């Protein structure tokens, strides 16, 4: 068989020029779109504000206009999904993860509009959902869409354009090219069998996707925490322990995200109305909290920098943590079109900080600075739950730019994935495509 | 399908034992990775303490230089040829191939021969990196623990062996991320699913890295401070630099292989005429390492110096040409030493050169050569060895200028592209091919 290898080696990394020029166009597109979704969600969350500022004086009128303005968006959200593509609901990656293994479909003619405008309304309303997966999925579909258009054959031009697309997606969502490429080659890919995916294409994809972003959002970052302090060697063990904490909690959260999916399902029994209704219900509760207590609502970013700086009293943190687990569980387990990736970055950040503070003074000799453990634990949930430490770390890194902390970030992240496996956790994203890919049969 | 649901729900469950091993392996590849680093130092140093001791007399100096070097080189090639002709060359291909069960992992042999061998080939100061040399000491250390505690399965095998190669490249550049990425992008079986435990590889790298840090904290390998940023209307200049590397990447790939043939004659496999031509080149290194330091040695020393723009354009061109040659000589001559690092040094020099031309051909971009240096520092690792993703994440960890990440990719990928588009090949695979093919024909 080695008589085969020698042949392959000498042939390695020769991807069809055409598959390439396409990863490039796909990228450019997933980019332009990735931006438009970003800009849109903004415009909305803003109007909603421009409307509270316009009812300033009257309070319960305010709280009402808040709730409704939100609820109305949420409804228009769930709806579009349920009435035109029940897949756009949930994160948005599993249906791509599975679409990679040819175990799910890529109906772009549908899911494009429904995931965009859908989430563009679910997020625009300000629910605890990220543009995370939502952009990934808009991604893949855009790839398949160009695939079909210029009609390209082969499993290579299929898996490729579809996988580069998902990546170019996660890239423009966090302006983190490396983390995108790494998400594919670590999570998205077929996690149980060699695949014909062109990594050189994926790159060109991410590259274009990222240029586009940069072209529209330069002069500012998503997260900015400035160069935090360094992390002494006799300090690393505290990151193993924080890594442990996430590892045990990672699975638990994984249950709640699935369970709540069942439980909440009753409350509408698949009925488009009682659903879209319970939709506007949660949606509204978001507008309301997004005002009465902003931390508990919205994506999560806003408060990231604020928590890393140590501006939230310990207590305040605990509240925000608990209040978030809940609101994130609600919005996501309730099949609303929106990611849970970002909200997890926000969750870890808060837990990490908390840990920080306890350490920051339980060991005055270490000269600790909570903010480090925040950066450490910011992709820790993305580790213990979704189980892709390598992508978590390289994501955090690109966003928080504190490479000095890289060692503690890993010892935490890995320390997590470890305790997670050691306690039965599972790739939250796979634990979804399972249930899904199952029920399709189960429904037989 | 129905199988899938089963697999998914079972994902990422690597045998606790395979893990606790990746951890010990790592600790070991670490301790060793360091000792090799410390050793090569001690030597390059004595050699100096000996020139300082013959200060006055010049041709006596130049001689003591050449010989002290040549003697090490000889003791180098020898050990290899007389006890493990595989320690010669980089050291990765025999691990790359060892991963596909197309080559062997004789650790009881290659450990001492690669260590002390290179610890003498590098200690003498030849244009060779501790790059692959450490990777290979790595893998072998994994297989060694594998055998010792005797673990079965293809997973317990491929894993400890692959984590080991990674923990290796990690302690060689103190770059954990780049190590993990080297495996999952270059080392791992390129054309067929494999049973490699990435969670293990990590634990491996982690331990390997702690060890390093425990012995080399308070200083970096490369330090270039926060360079300037890179404007969008500036990115195209990185595509063009990426093109330049892409065309040259294959060419260099030929020379590294060809020179391997050519130089082979000059000893015809004969342990003596080889070990002799060995001390020949080795000596030429001590000599140049003194008369013109840039042209010799690993390459690091001059990296920072070239990024700062301290070498006149001309001076760069010289150092480039002089380096292609000396790197080709030492590596194509089957001496036990990597060519990974020497390529980092090469790109850095080419990138800078490009820089300077740009730095003034476009006074309106407010350029700063040093950026293109960081950009092109892992550009050869891209156009030649073809692993842009590991190159980039390596440079990043070493030069810590994430701001430049976009230009670094547009260059790197821009290279791999022009390289493929011109027939280049994974220099490391283009070796295991030759190896594997000849080995039978």
């Amino acid at each position: 068989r080695r008589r085969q290898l020698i042949r392959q080696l000498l042939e390695r990394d020769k991807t069809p020029l055409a598959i390439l020029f396409m990863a490039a166009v796909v990228g450019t597109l997933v980019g332009l779109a990735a931006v438009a979704f970003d800009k849109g969600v903004a415009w909305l969350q803003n109007q909603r504000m421009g409307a509270l500022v316009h009812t300033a004086d009257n309070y319960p009128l305010l709280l009402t206009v808040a709730f409704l303005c939100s609820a109305v968006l949420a409804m228009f959200g769930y709806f579009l999904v349920r009435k035109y593509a029940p897949e756009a609901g949930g994160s948005g990656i599993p249906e791509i993860e599975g679409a990679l293994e040819d175990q799910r479909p890529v109906r772009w003619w549908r899911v494009l509009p429904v995931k965009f405008f859908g989430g563009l309304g679910t997020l625009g309303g300000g629910m605890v959902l990220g543009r995370a997966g939502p952009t990934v999925q808009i991604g893949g579909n855009i790839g398949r869409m160009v695939l079909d258009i210029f009609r390209l054959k082969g499993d290579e031009a299929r898996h490729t354009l579809l996988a580069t697309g998902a990546a170019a997606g996660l890239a423009a969502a966090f302006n983190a090219p490396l983390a995108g490429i790494l998400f594919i080659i670590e999570e998205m890919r077929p996690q149980f069998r060699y695949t014909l995916i062109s990594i050189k294409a994926v790159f060109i994809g991410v590259i274009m996707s990222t240029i586009m972003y940069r072209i529209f959002n330069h002069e500012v970052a998503l997260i900015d925490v400035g160069k935090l302090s360094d992390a002494p060697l006799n300090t690393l063990w505290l990151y193993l322990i924080l890594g442990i904490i996430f590892g045990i909690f990672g699975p638990i959260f994984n249950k709640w995200v699935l369970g709540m999916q069942d439980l909440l399902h009753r409350v509408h029994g698949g009925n488009i109305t009682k659903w879209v209704l319970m939709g506007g219900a949660i949606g509204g509760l978001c507008g309301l909290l997004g005002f009465v207590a902003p931390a508990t609502s919205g994506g999560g970013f806003n408060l990231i920098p604020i928590a890393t700086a140590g501006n939230f009293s310990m207590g305040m943190l605990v509240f925000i943590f608990v209040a978030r687990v809940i609101t994130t569980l609600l919005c996501f387990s309730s099949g609303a079109p929106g990611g849970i990736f970002a909200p997890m970055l926000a969750l870890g950040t808060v837990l990490g900080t908390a840990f920080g503070m306890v350490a920051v003074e339980l060991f005055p000799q270490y000269h600790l600075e909570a903010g480090t453990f925040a950066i450490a634990g910011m992709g820790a949930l993305l580790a213990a739950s979704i189980r892709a430490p390598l992508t978590g770390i390289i994501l955090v890194l690109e966003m928080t730019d504190n490479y000095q902390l890289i060692l503690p970030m890993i010892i935490t992240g890995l320390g997590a994935t470890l305790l997670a496996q050691f306690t039965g956790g599972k790739p939250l994203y796979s634990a979804i495509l399972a249930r899904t890919l199952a029920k399709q049969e189960a429904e037989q | 399908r129905r199988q899938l649901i089963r697999q998914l729900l079972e994902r990422d469950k690597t045998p606790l034992a395979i893990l606790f091993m990746a951890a010990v392996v790592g600790t070991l590849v670490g301790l060793a990775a360091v000792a090799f680093d410390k050793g090569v130092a001690w030597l390059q140093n004595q050699r100096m303490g000996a020139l300082v001791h013959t200060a006055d007399n010049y041709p006596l100096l130049l001689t003591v230089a050449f010989l002290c070097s040549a003697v090490l080189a000889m003791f180098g090639y020898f050990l290899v040829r007389k006890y493990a002709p595989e320690a010669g060359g980089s050291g990765i291909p025999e691990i790359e191939g060892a991963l596909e069960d197309q080559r062997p992992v004789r650790w009881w042999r290659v450990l001492p021969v690669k260590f002390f061998g290179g610890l003498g080939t590098l200690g003498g100061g030849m244009v060779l990196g501790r790059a692959g040399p450490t990777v290979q000491i790595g893998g072998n250390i994994g297989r060694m623990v594998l055998d010792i505690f005797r673990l079965k399965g293809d997973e317990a095998r491929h894993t400890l062996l692959a984590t080991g190669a990674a923990a290796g490249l990690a302690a060689a550049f103190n770059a954990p991320l780049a190590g993990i990425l080297f495996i999952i992008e270059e080392m791992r079986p390129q054309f067929r699913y494999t049973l490699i435990s990435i969670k293990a590889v990590f634990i491996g790298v982690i331990m390997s890295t702690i060890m390093y840090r425990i012995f080399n904290h308070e200083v970096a390998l490369i330090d270039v401070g926060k360079l300037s940023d890179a404007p969008l209307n500036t990115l195209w200049l990185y595509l063009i630099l990426g093109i330049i590397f892409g065309i040259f990447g294959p060419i260099f790939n030929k020379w590294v292989l060809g020179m391997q043939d050519l130089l082979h004659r000059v000893h015809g496999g004969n342990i003596t005429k080889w070990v002799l031509m060995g001390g020949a080149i080795g000596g030429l290194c001590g000599l140049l390492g003194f008369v013109a330091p840039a042209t010799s040695g690993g390459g690091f020393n001059l990296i920072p110096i070239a990024t700062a723009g301290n070498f006149s354009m001309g001076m760069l061109v010289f150092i480039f040409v002089a380096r292609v040659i000396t790197t080709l000589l030492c590596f194509s001559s089957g001496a036990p030493g990597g060519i990974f690092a020497p390529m980092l040094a090469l790109g850095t020099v080419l990138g800078t050169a490009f820089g300077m031309v740009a730095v003034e051909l476009f006074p309106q971009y407010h350029l700063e050569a040093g950026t293109f240096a960081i950009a092109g520092m892992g550009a050869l690792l891209a156009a030649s060895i073809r692993a842009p993703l590991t190159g980039i994440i390596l440079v990043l960890e070493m030069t810590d200028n994430y701001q430049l990440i976009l230009p670094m990719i547009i260059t790197g990928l821009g290279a791999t592209l022009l390289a493929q588009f011109t027939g280049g090949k994974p220099l490391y695979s283009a070796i295991l091919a030759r190896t594997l093919a000849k080995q039978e024909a």
Partner: antibody, heavy 120, light 107 residues
Framework: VRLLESGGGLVQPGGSLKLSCAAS????????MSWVRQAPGKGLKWIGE????????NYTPSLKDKFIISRDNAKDTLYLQISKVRSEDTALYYC??????????????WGAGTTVTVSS | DIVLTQSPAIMSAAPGDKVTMTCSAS?????IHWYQQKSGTSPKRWIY???KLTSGVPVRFSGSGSGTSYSLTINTMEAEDAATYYC?????????FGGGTKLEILR
């Protein structure tokens, strides 16, 4: 890295003087700074330390505002405010930059020192 | 807070001579440090983390110990070792200091 300190002098018991540390030679931030003091031919004692973002100040066990350590990361200077000056405070005050290897912090680079003489 | 107790309060030795002094901890400690203080001069950091010589410390210098007792040692004590060493710790906050040991020359 040079550490120059000023402000030492004669003071009325009860008074309250302010000592300064002028740092030349290193990114003053990223660093911790602390005051150690040595009584007239006697042991060295640690007054206190203060980080970069000035968000953490610790002092050896002593009455609230017995000491006020502060830092201006815009002049790279470290200050020490001593109150209700007694006789014990008659000592040699040293400022130093804190740094470590493993994480068991040491007083990296010290400074010349300034004398505080407390007398009527 | 730990009480570092430097063993010999004083002592004398002749150039070219091995010398050892101590540091006794009121409790456990880890990786202590030693500073050399030249009469009328601002404290210089010598050994650190029980042993490491600071970039410049004469090689004849070393010392160490552990648990609850460390030491400074000079193998062949030259002249330029006229001063006082203070063993300081900070493994346990707040950091403390030994009463020092005075290295006086015998002649």
């Amino acid at each position: 890295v040079r550490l120059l300190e000023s402000g030492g002098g004669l003071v009325q018991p009860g008074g309250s003087l302010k000592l300064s540390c002028a740092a030349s030679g290193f990114d003053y931030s990223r660093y911790w700074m602390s005051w150690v003091r040595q009584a007239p031919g006697k042991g060295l004692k640690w007054i206190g330390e203060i980080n970069p973002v000035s968000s953490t100040i610790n002092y050896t066990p002593s009455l609230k505002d017995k000491f006020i350590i502060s830092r201006d990361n815009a002049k790279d200077t470290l200050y020490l405010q001593i109150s209700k000056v007694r006789s014990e405070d008659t000592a040699l005050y040293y400022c130093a930059r804190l740094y470590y290897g493993y994480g068991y912090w040491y007083f990296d680079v010290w400074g010349a020192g300034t004398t505080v003489t407390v007398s009527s | 807070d730990i009480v570092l107790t430097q063993s010999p309060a004083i002592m004398s030795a002749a150039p070219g001579d091995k010398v050892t002094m101590t540091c006794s901890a009121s409790s456990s400690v880890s990786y202590i440090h030693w500073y050399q203080q030249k009469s009328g001069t601002s404290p210089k950091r010598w050994i650190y983390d029980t042993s490491k010589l600071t970039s410049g410390v004469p090689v004849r210098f070393s010392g160490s110990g552990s648990g609850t007792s460390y030491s400074l040692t000079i193998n062949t004590m030259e002249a330029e070792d006229a001063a006082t060493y203070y063993c300081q710790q900070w493994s346990s906050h707040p950091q403390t200091f030994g009463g020092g040991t005075k290295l006086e020359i015998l002649r």
